[PDB]
Amino acid sequence: TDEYQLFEELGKGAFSVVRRCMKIPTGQEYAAKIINTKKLSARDHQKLEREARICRLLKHPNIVRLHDSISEEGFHYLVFDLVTGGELFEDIVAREYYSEADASHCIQQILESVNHCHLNGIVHRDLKPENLLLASKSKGAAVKLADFGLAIEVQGDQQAWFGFAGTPGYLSPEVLRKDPYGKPVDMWACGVILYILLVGYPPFWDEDQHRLYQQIKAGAYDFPSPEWDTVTPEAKDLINKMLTINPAKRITASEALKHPWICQRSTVASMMHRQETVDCLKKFNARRKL
Ligand SMILES: CCN(CC)[C@@H](C)CNC(=O)c1cc(-c2cnn3ccc(-c4cccs4)nc23)nc(N2CC(O)C2)c1
């Protein structure tokens, strides 16, 4: 607290807040994720050091950029370069024109961030809309993957039981079966996110969490009419490759970047405005706040 001035709250985590801050000598603005100590558990300092270590490692145009890590008695401070564009999903629902080409561009940037994690031995484990930020429209509006509080370090392509973590709507079948897992769990979540980007509601849902899990473990998603009839088959195909329940057969981020809907978007992705997706996304966002 000797070096930064804190300003307004930007968002909330389970045991954290993110506030805009300024380094008092330089006048430079940043964002500080401030992790509280309400909950104390066995390996606290190992978890905090891991999050900082993973954040220090990852330097990519589509990943948040760590500046400093500061340990205090009651709080821990992870200081990042500030991005001012807000959450991706809140940006989309404010658009007046939003098409498959726009979803494809978003997913491509997400895929670049996820591929960069995996090449560096990092599994994020908590890919979800609220962890996707935006650089300012004045700065190019690059998608920024954020919050590595749940992320793990893996040795190459070796897989193991790394614990139960993540967000229910985005959990992978291998995690719900308590099977060993790894990098593919992020491509599963990427597939859930892509589905929502196209029609504005999730592929797996039930107010009963037990039935939600049963649906994920079955991998039983579909493309109902009429809203999916206007979606290109190539977009559906990419979802199919990400949402296969055998993680061995799931497309990797490096492969997904070569999918025609991603890398030939001007000729493969539809340019039709999807106003129903905007309408449903607004509801989707509002429910997740409550
Ligand atoms: C992302 C995870 N959060 C829970 C912790 C979600 C659930 C809630 N939202 C926010 O935390 C949020 C964050 C930021 C923000 C701006 N620079 N920056 C730089 C680094 C980081 C982070 C690094 C590691 C974790 S966050 N975050 C930011 N800007 C926001 N917005 C809304 C307003 O329009 C500007 C909202």
CATH number of the domain enclosing 50: 3.30.200.20
Query: Is 102 an annotated catalytic residue?
Result: no
Whether residues 165 and 39 share a domain: the answer is: no
Whether residues 254 and 171 share a domain: the answer is: yes
CB proximity list for 53: less than 8 A, separation 6 or greater: none
Within the chain, strands assigned E span: 4-13, 16-23, 28-36, 66-71, 75-81, 122-123, 132-134, 143-145, 152-153
**Centroid of chain to Cα 38:** 25
* Positive or negative torsion for Cα 255, 253, 89, 143: negative
For a ligand 1 pocket test, name from 133, 145, 150 the mutation site with the most ligand atoms within 8 angstroms of its C-beta.
133
d(CA 221, CA 204): 7
The residue type found at 15 is F
Domain that holds residue 87: 83-290
Whether residues 237 and 102 share a domain: the answer is: yes
Q: How far away, in angstroms, is 142 Cα from ligand 1 center?
A: 14
**Centroid of chain to Cα 222:** 22
**Sequence-ordered alpha helix ranges (H) in the chain:** 44-57, 88-92, 100-119, 173-176, 184-199, 209-218, 233-242, 253-256, 260-263, 265-268, 275-289
Q: Which of 50, 82, 114 is the last residue of a domain?
A: 82
The token pair at 162 is 């790394």
Whether residues 31 and 56 share a domain: the answer is: yes
Whether residues 117 and 40 share a domain: the answer is: no
Method used to determine the 3D structure: X-ray
The token pair at 263 is 């890398």
d(CA 265, CA 162): 36
Whether residues 67 and 106 share a domain: the answer is: no
- Dihedral over alpha carbons 285, 287, 288, 289 (to 10 degrees): 90
Give the chain's domain count. Answer: 2
What's the residue count for the chain? 290
d(CA 173, CA 188): 9
